[PDB]
Amino acid sequence: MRECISVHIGQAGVQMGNACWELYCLEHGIQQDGIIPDDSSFGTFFSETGSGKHVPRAVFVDLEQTVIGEIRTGHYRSLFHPEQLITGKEDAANNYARGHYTIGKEIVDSVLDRVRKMADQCSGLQGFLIFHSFGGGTGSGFTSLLMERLSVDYGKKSKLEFSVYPAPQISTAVVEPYNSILTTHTTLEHSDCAFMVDNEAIYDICNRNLDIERPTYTNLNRLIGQIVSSITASLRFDGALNVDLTEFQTNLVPYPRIHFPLVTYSPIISAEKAYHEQLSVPEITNACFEYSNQMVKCDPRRGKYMACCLLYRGDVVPKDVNAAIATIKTRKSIQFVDWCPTGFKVGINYQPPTAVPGGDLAKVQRAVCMLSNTTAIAEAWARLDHKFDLMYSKRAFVHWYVGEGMEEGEFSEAREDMAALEKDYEEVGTES
Amino acid sequence: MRECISVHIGQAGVQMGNACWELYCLEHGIQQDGIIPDDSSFGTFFSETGSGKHVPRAVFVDLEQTVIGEIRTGHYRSLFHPEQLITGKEDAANNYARGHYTIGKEIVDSVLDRVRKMADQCSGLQGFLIFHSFGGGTGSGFTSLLMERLSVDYGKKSKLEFSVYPAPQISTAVVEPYNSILTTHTTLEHSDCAFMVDNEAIYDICNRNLDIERPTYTNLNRLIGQIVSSITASLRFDGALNVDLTEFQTNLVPYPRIHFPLVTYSPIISAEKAYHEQLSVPEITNACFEYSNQMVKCDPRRGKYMACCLLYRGDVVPKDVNAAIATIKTRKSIQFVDWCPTGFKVGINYQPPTAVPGGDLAKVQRAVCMLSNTTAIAEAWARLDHKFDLMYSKRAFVHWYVGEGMEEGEFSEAREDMAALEKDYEEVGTES
Amino acid sequence: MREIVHLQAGQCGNQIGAKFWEVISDEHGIDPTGAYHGDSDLQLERINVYYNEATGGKYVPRAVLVDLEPGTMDSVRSGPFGQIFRPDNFVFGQSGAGNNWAKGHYTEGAELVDSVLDVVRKEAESCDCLQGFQLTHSLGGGTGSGMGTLLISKIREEYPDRIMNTFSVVPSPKVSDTVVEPYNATLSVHQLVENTDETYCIDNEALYDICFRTLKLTTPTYGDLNHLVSATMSGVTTCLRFPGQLNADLRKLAVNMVPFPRLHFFMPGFAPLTSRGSQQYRALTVPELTQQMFDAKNMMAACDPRHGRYLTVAAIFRGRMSMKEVDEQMLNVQNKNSSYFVEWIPNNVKTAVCDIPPRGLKMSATFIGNSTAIQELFKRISEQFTAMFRRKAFLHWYTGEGMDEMEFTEAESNMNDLVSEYQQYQDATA
Amino acid sequence: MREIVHLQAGQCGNQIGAKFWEVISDEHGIDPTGAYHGDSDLQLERINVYYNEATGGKYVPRAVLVDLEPGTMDSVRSGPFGQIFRPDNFVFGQSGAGNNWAKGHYTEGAELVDSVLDVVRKEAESCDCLQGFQLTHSLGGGTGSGMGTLLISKIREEYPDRIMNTFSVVPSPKVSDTVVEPYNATLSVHQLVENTDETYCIDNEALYDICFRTLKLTTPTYGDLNHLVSATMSGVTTCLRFPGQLNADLRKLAVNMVPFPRLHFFMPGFAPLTSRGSQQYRALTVPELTQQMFDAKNMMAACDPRHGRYLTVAAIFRGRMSMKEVDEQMLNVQNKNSSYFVEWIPNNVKTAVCDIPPRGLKMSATFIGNSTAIQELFKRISEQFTAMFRRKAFLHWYTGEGMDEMEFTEAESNMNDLVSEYQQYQDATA
Ligand SMILES: Nc1nc2c(ncn2[C@@H]2O[C@H](COP(=O)(O)OP(=O)(O)OP(=O)(O)O)[C@@H](O)[C@H]2O)c(=O)[nH]1
Ligand SMILES: Nc1nc2c(ncn2[C@@H]2O[C@H](COP(=O)(O)OP(=O)(O)OP(=O)(O)O)[C@@H](O)[C@H]2O)c(=O)[nH]1
Ligand SMILES: Nc1nc2c(ncn2[C@@H]2O[C@H](COP(=O)(O)OP(=O)(O)O)[C@@H](O)[C@H]2O)c(=O)[nH]1
Ligand SMILES: Nc1nc2c(ncn2[C@@H]2O[C@H](COP(=O)(O)OP(=O)(O)O)[C@@H](O)[C@H]2O)c(=O)[nH]1
Numbered sequence A, B: 001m002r003e004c005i006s007v008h009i010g011q012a013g014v015q016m017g018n019a020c021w022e023l024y025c026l027e028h029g030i031q032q033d034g035i036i037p038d039d040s041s042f043g044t045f046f047s048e049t050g051s052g053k054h055v056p057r058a059v060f061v062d063l064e065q066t067v068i069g070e071i072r073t074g075h076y077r078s079l080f081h082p083e084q085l086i087t088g089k090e091d092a093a094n095n096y097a098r099g100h101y102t103i104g105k106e107i108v109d110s111v112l113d114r115v116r117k118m119a120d121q122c123s124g125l126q127g128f129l130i131f132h133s134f135g136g137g138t139g140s141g142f143t144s145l146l147m148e149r150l151s152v153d154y155g156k157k158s159k160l161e162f163s164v165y166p167a168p169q170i171s172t173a174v175v176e177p178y179n180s181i182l183t184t185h186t187t188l189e190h191s192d193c194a195f196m197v198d199n200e201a202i203y204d205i206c207n208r209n210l211d212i213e214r215p216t217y218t219n220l221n222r223l224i225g226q227i228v229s230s231i232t233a234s235l236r237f238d239g240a241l242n243v244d245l246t247e248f249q250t251n252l253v254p255y256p257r258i259h260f261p262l263v264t265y266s267p268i269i270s271a272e273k274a275y276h277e278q279l280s281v282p283e284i285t286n287a288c289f290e291y292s293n294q295m296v297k298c299d300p301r302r303g304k305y306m307a308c309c310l311l312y313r314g315d316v317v318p319k320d321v322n323a324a325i326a327t328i329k330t331r332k333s334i335q336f337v338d339w340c341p342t343g344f345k346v347g348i349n350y351q352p353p354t355a356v357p358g359g360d361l362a363k364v365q366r367a368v369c370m371l372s373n374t375t376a377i378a379e380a381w382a383r384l385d386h387k388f389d390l391m392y393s394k395r396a397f398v399h400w401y402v403g404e405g406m407e408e409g410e411f412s413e414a415r416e417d418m419a420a421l422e423k424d425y426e427e428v429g430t431e432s
Numbered sequence C, D: 001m002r003e004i005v006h007l008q009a010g011q012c013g014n015q016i017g018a019k020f021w022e023v024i025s026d027e028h029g030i031d032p033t034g035a036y037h038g039d040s041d042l043q044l045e046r047i048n049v050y051y052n053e054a055t056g057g058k059y060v061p062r063a064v065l066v067d068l069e070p071g072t073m074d075s076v077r078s079g080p081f082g083q084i085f086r087p088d089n090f091v092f093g094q095s096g097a098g099n100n101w102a103k104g105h106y107t108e109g110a111e112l113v114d115s116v117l118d119v120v121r122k123e124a125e126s127c128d129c130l131q132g133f134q135l136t137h138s139l140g141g142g143t144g145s146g147m148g149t150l151l152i153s154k155i156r157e158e159y160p161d162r163i164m165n166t167f168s169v170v171p172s173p174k175v176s177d178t179v180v181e182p183y184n185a186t187l188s189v190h191q192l193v194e195n196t197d198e199t200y201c202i203d204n205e206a207l208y209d210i211c212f213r214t215l216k217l218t219t220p221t222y223g224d225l226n227h228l229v230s231a232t233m234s235g236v237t238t239c240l241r242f243p244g245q246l247n248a249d250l251r252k253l254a255v256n257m258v259p260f261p262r263l264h265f266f267m268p269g270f271a272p273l274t275s276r277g278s279q280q281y282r283a284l285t286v287p288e289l290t291q292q293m294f295d296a297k298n299m300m301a302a303c304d305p306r307h308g309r310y311l312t313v314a315a316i317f318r319g320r321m322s323m324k325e326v327d328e329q330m331l332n333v334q335n336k337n338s339s340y341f342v343e344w345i346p347n348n349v350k351t352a353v354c355d356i357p358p359r360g361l362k363m364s365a366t367f368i369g370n371s372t373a374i375q376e377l378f379k380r381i382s383e384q385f386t387a388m389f390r391r392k393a394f395l396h397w398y399t400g401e402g403m404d405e406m407e408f409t410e411a412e413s414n415m416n417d418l419v420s421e422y423q424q425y426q427d428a429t430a
């Protein structure tokens, strides 16, 4: 009855999608194909056919064809609908203009068609889960192009997006500040709630708690896969206090332009050291509010919380959650904003987290994913804006963007909008 | 319900900890791991997990990583929580400044976190048991740094510490007088009661009563392990007259700055010569007040007693204790101070002392540990202060301490405080 | 005669409702398949109060299960006693409310309420003598708060003279399950103060204390809490279903418990409540049941009665008892705690004694209290609402569905009036 | 009617209390599970004095067990007759008193006394006719001395007219179990002289002599001593529970044993007490029981009566006896030892004879003595207190919890007044 349309754009989203759909297949008993050997649970993400083939309700799009071609040759080759896997001719070359103006104009009309064919096949539409990179290229340009198309064809339907936010120090491309601001400008009015994750932060977690000194991108994607499963667990599985995708909007978004919650997953613990831990509800819940465990390298205590969603799993007693949150409320270090006395949204689900074979996480009994909207993120946007100002003062790389359909005016408009956003964060952080 | 957080700092404390936790595991039936094969006794020192693993409630910290690394490779490797074993990069080089100012500043924030994670997991907090060396290095600098942090975060909670006091003649380092006074200055106002033991005194006991001419550090630690077990026996086991950790404070500390009781363990007897001894209560009790059996080389008869705590074990009849103490009170040689007519605190426990396999102590039926606060210790402090004056008159090694964060003023302040302490001992030793 | 029609709403209501019918079916001897297998014949005499008869002895609850999403109902029918319900009564949509009162009331439930009434009217018209409507919901969400209040307005406009009683789960003070509770609660209260005769306020936090203190329950699930709520729901409707020395109809309670029209918010309680290990240390007699019923630590609402005065109180006893003990004990409470009772009401206790107790208990008693101390709950909500509303915290979600800021001010003003009214009647004559 | 509510405190009180209920349950035929299996029906007639009835014949002690640490209570419930108690009555904290009166009274028990009274009042209100409160504690510690005296003040303020009797274990002169006994004792006495009607002082040293001299017991455990204390505790409350020729209520003793308000400290005794090998050399008759009761070597207090005079004396006999023998023997003691008795009191003996003796003994007798020689105990404590207080021995532990040096002076002054008062009334008329 419930459904979610997953669009995976770019290399980061596509590669993250493989981790996500490797986990959804595991949790639902699927066999790496559409076959379930000899139920209303899997219906949320998988469409069914008379032959017994369960087809993912996802669209893989990339102007580059290398990463999606790997899927067509990998273990999940027979899973996805061949037309869902859409590949372009040439990549965006880490340029926002190419993804949005030049190349995206030859693929958006094709991907939106498959979204149309998927939307009308659903008994009831619930929202969108968009996976993309904030660094640039297809994840910045094409996502903005596709997001605006959805906001017109599907309007008020929920549109959630998961983004790999640029790291403070680590960086893999030279023009990320240009692309990051450009996509932010064109997605504030078309996105309901965007969840942020940073490569640098998860590297620290994978080395600070998981005892692994050689994290790859595969390890990070699996950690991200668990978060999305926790978010969508309510639709897939029964629970004591269910939370829907449309609930995240009004719970975490106080104002339309401030919709960037952080992300956290508490029991990120190695198998060996899990034998010396109780892993009770109070300790995992307290772990969420520690800076050392955040998935985005932004210290929460630099600002005030304004919305927190605790999504529990497994053997969790609501009495423990009530007490656990109350003691957190008592602490003076964890400072919420004055205008939000009602700051916690609680979701409890009975299905425990499933460990992907060959993974690193332990066989945890109970897990909690925290989605916190904090004013501290304004500092990260300030850092990002500062990088843009330096490069743009010299017009460091503008000739590339201007030469592929874009105009100089967009740089001024894009940055001015971000300045307003930073100012908006200041207003919300003060009372009376 | 009761609990104790044990912090073992430095080589002496860590090595003493191995003896202590080898004995606690024995007394509670544990199998050198967290496993008890197919009870409210072990809860005081060990936390429990659903898997059946009992985790020590202790923190092993050392800036040097050699000794703690040995634990990670020894028989008790699987016992301790891996994060409890905290190791630094470089040692304190027998320098107080390094442990407190330079290196300790990069490990204290980590050890205190695990203390925070342990304190909040206890049903009720009772106190701290700190094991460290008085000689210098991590046992002098880091302990003072950690003790002051505890006095702020945990305030009025009991903070007991066990120290290996410098011997009168034997010495293993050249700058012990500097370190001993510096830690004493910064721990008087943050420590409730410190129990003293000397290497030289236990060497004599191990060769005067135990018939062993080759004592190692392993032998001494096992003797120290018994003392701590006797102190904490009341919490662990039932008894006729129980004594709590918070009781030692008001019973042995008449004035805030005089909180250095001596230590004694009466039936330190070899197995062979135990066949010719009755080992009745009166004789073991009388043995405590003999100079030949004190664990600290300070003759009690040079000064007056002001507080004694007799902690019995095994088959002990309170009638015998009443008579045994009374006859001691009669003796004129055992001189208590005038202002303490009420000088004895009696604790009787039913659990007999367990002999560690491969040890030297006999299978004694009943044992008594005496904790005596005596004015005679003032002479030992006077000797220690005298050594400091000689070296400091020439500024023997000040350039090392001053070059690692410390200042010259601390030497004057530290010694002036000790001079007041020696004067305070004189005031308490006189009446009218 | 005197039939009651049960109306579910939202996740909370459906969850409690499912437990409610498990309890009701138990005391009436109805199997999960609908068949009757009870021993006593008294439990079948007045079975028409909650059930409609079908061929072959099948008894169908007169219940309507509604929510904007299919999941909670799908869980209900799959769980025990889920097949007992009539399938036609599962009136549900597809796109749920996102915990905003506006969507469930104005946008999403507005297009579904018409279908719901088509089942309510059909159930109502099948009664020989309709007594009232029973609604189970929660004030902290969208569906229960929004859609539930919409149904209350529709039914009260269509059945003006029938008694409407609601069992609402109220937001707790200590901690929240939803960031927009003050908006949902204040708007919902604006509709209850006008279109219901008796609302039984209960908060999850209070029930946790009962499980922790009295029941000594170490793993309290939501099923455990719903049992406590179900117990009080059954207790207030026993005189309609079983004989007793002194009966008390639902309306009989409203007259004795509602002095003024808008002071109709009650905080319930139940007894006996003891742990498994402490049961062999209790006499289980009238004197001690009444001793804990008036205890502030045994009421399913957060508000402490000690902070205000009781306008009225009701004690519906169940089981064979000495009426002398009941009358004396009620008077004894009145005399000792005279400071806790409004003086211009000479008698503040209404007693009802039913002959048949709940299964497994020789004696039982349900406590209902209309106290001026309940203003603490409403005033606490008002403080939370004004703080958020003072700087347009989340109104774009509500105003985006069609609401207006004027409505929010009206809802807040009405809440303040109710709090003031409770304070006015807390003072003595002249 | 004439119910007694028992209140434990500290390790000493709980240890004695556990033995007390083992003795009481024995003479009333109560099994450790709470069931009654006695032979005589007289032991069930007045069982309400100490026990409350429950379904199935379970009889629950009207006892409240309290201590700041869980260990001693955990030992109590684990030991024999430990499950008989009601779990709700185990009111305990987590952080114990460190043997300092300040912590148990002002800092640690101050936040726990409110919970304790919630059980004391509940027990008290269940009595048909409350007679008094029975407290067992020790003066040498923190919990019993501190927390116990706090409860005494609270109850005496809440039940002014009920008789409060305390069984306190007093510090011994010969040797101590705690360095701060003088501080704890003097402060505790400052509260007893004002808020209790009869305190039975006992010291462990005296009980050791009884075990050594009379019982010839070579391995005396603390359980053995608690049996002696339990025996006298039972003896003073037999006329309430069993019939007799000449009854003596607890208040009946207080009037006859307390001439002036503050001279209400008693030193108890018991008889017969003989070893196993010397039992076949005793006649076991009234003349010899009275012969050892007044012996200074058979009293459970250190103070020798020979050093002062008896203001009053009570002899509660048990078992069938010749009242002529009792009256004559009491008079004979009066005549021979006329120098030991205050002259301005013409008669110094109060006699009570209960028909039913303790199990295993044909005859028994309990001795209670209000003697001016008890000032030796108080004056000895004062000397120890002033020596420590003269140079601030340990006050920083007490003053650190909130006490003041002014309070210590007040406590010392009151103690000196009591010692002086005992000396005043030791002299003849004019
Ligand atoms: N978390 C995570 N981030 C990734 C992963 N792969 C790429 N990224 C991020 O993606 C950012 C750059 O955008 P890309 O996804 O690599 O480029 P694109 O979206 O494929 O667009 P093109 O440049 O046309 O290829 C880098 O800075 C990475 O941080 C991944 O597997 N996991
Ligand atoms: N009883 C006992 N004492 C020890 C033992 N090991 C070291 N000590 C004492 O520790 C004193 C010196 O302090 P150490 O512990 O060696 O130095 P540290 O604490 O590791 O600090 P660093 O100098 O930085 O290494 C010596 O004088 C020894 O008497 C031991 O195993 N048993
Ligand atoms: N006792 C109980 N309370 C519930 C249950 N589900 C939700 N609640 C309560 O309902 C409130 C959340 O509102 P909810 O009913 O889920 O939103 P709605 O679905 O739009 O009506 C919280 O205060 C929860 O405590 C349940 O199964 N049992
Ligand atoms: N008979 C008996 N006396 C005890 C026992 N434990 C302690 N005492 C007495 O109690 C006094 C010590 O005070 P204590 O009760 O331990 O301190 P508290 O725990 O703060 O109340 C001493 O005089 C002991 O003789 C026991 O188990 N049996």
Ligand SMILES: [Mg+2]
Pocket: A010, A011, A064, A091, A137
């Ligand atoms: Mg690419």
Ligand SMILES: [Mg+2]
Pocket: B010, B011, B064, B091, B092, B137
């Ligand atoms: Mg070292």
